[PDB]
Amino acid sequence: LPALIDTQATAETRALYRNLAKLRYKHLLFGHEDSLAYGVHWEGDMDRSDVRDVTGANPAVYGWELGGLELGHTANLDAVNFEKMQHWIKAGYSRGGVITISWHVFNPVSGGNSWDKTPAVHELIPGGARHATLKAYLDTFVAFNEGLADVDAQGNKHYPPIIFRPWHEHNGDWFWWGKGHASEQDYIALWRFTVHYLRDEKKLRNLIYAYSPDRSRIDMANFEAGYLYGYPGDAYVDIIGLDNYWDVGHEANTASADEQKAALTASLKQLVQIARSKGKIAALTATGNNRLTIDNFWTERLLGPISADADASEIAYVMVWRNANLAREKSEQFFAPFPGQATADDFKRFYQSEVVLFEDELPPLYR
Template sequence: MKSFYLIACFLLGEWVINPVCAQLIDSKATSETKALYHHLVSLSGKKIMFGHQDDLAYGVHWKYEDGRSDIKEVINDFPAVFGWDIGGIEHWHSNNLDSVPFDRMKKFIIEAYHKGAINTISWHTDNPVTGGNSWDTTRAVKEILPGGKYHSLFVSWLDRVATFLNSLETRDGVKIPILFRPFHELNGGWFWWGRPYCSPEEYKDLWKFTIEYLRDVRHIHQLIYVYNTNSFSNELEFTERYPGKELTDMLSLDIYQRAPLNASKEQLENSSRKFEKQLKENLKVVVQIAHQEHKLSALSETGFEAIPVKDWWTGVLYKTIKNFPISYVLVWRNHGFMEAKNKIHYFAPFKGQKSAGDFKKLYKKKRMLFLKATKKINLYQ
């Protein structure tokens, strides 16, 4: 039986996940979480869901208006994936690090679930050693592991995360499944859990403790755990901190296109070529490792601030990702005007934005899924 199972796992085409082999790491996962996971597996290689950070909370020219979404106002449909961040929950703050009130976020997450969409959560947690923010790179990982000086403090923070996650439930008591992406962009040097500030083994231990505490001690059984790096130079950089197939459900990548403010046409074209090359090279590694490990994959953060390329959605992004079996692609938030930087900060189109017409073309791509199509799938059944 075991030999048959192993052979079956490799009978499908390149990079496509075999449902026989893909299993959640939580054997006690809720029925809704299992259903979501198996739908994602079945869609792998066929469809790519589109996501947007904080989509229901605010847009470029509005904030906290029921039913609004910059995406919806362009295509008359919502994203299929809604991204949120719980940075600040560790202190029981009223608002997260981007000033979204947690009580509103809870309502948005429940709303997205009832719409038939997926919710994904990251955690820009503060530095537990200094009390500084996520970008305070004072070494902390070793100190919050079992036996460390700040371990008890970190456990208390995980308790608050667990309490919030458990509060995300319907009136009938159904716990809402979440794609949970903690300690993200782990190979970068900007967060205190980043590559320069802890060893590979320390990072793996942090991941292992976090997952096992939430799952086995706090009995959170509605999470799908997402391992995440920033763009990388080679396969070793992506895998050296990978905690193993027993502790992850999905492998993912964050990568953004960048160009100088008021870049020339030539600069934008060069930037696009560079981005496409890096994205394609990185996704090849991500989906290959995911295939080997029988895991899902995703482009969990991407975008081009202010989207200065008119056909960026189909001419750059879709062109590059369309042949990869990623579950979803999510672009970052539409903050609006940033007074400190005297600019409008956004990554998704809004009505009248120069790339809105091309985004409508992306919406019509058969491979892309937005909410109306996703709702018909009944992801949680």
């Protein structure tokens, strides 16, 4: 019933969207960022994941990150080599997994990173002095995407579908495309251009577009209004996403565990209600408890509140963030366990849940 904004999307892309729409009622796909690139205690293996090391299975959804690609870097902002990333994307896809991509775009004005709040959006949008830069930036993704293609025996090109999730958490003020640094109208212009350019000018047919405000800057008393701040329109969005680290034990959140559980459920319920009204699909596009310090985090703080409400449960997937390599990054940051980590057994329970799907129990999503 939901239809993609790309009316000409590849058969595999259309199939993915249709199958997510069917599966969402009774199941939840589990995703992990940079899952094959490294783990907390390893890097270099060509086919490994902390998630698999714990459960025996790969995540169903593989998140990847392009920041730095736009600058012609060999590797992204977390030192993930782009060539390796292309191979890892193809490998996951070949096993039936789902691919999603974010993009912490560097600041073109200062040459700083996404957290450099020097204004840039007004300059990047059509009519802006730096509009050529936006095109050049997006062109690098067009090229990256070509490195994902195969050609069949008949000479037809095929690609992994990609859930493309740009310009995320835009209701926050921490990125240069965020509130306080870009007008709402200019953000909308940026979004609409991104879609026109990739879908219409460049004729990419393997993309599903995900919109992803941050829950931590939405007023729960007025959720829909907060959610739709900077919303570019139904003709520009396929997935009604949400980044919510807030209700899952964010260190700055003083709300009680029980209050947080209720808020997580309420946030996903309202997310799903918005998706329903718009004929889209909802998802929890980023979440997790950094360093997994919460007892039974997976069953008690994530799955329980999702499953508590039949609307909230209608999200198609949930993705947790990356397992930063300690030897390399100097500070513990991780959102999935690794063997011996305190929540590993509870993560096995999460995996074992009939509702939750990892790679190993996905139906064929691409037909």
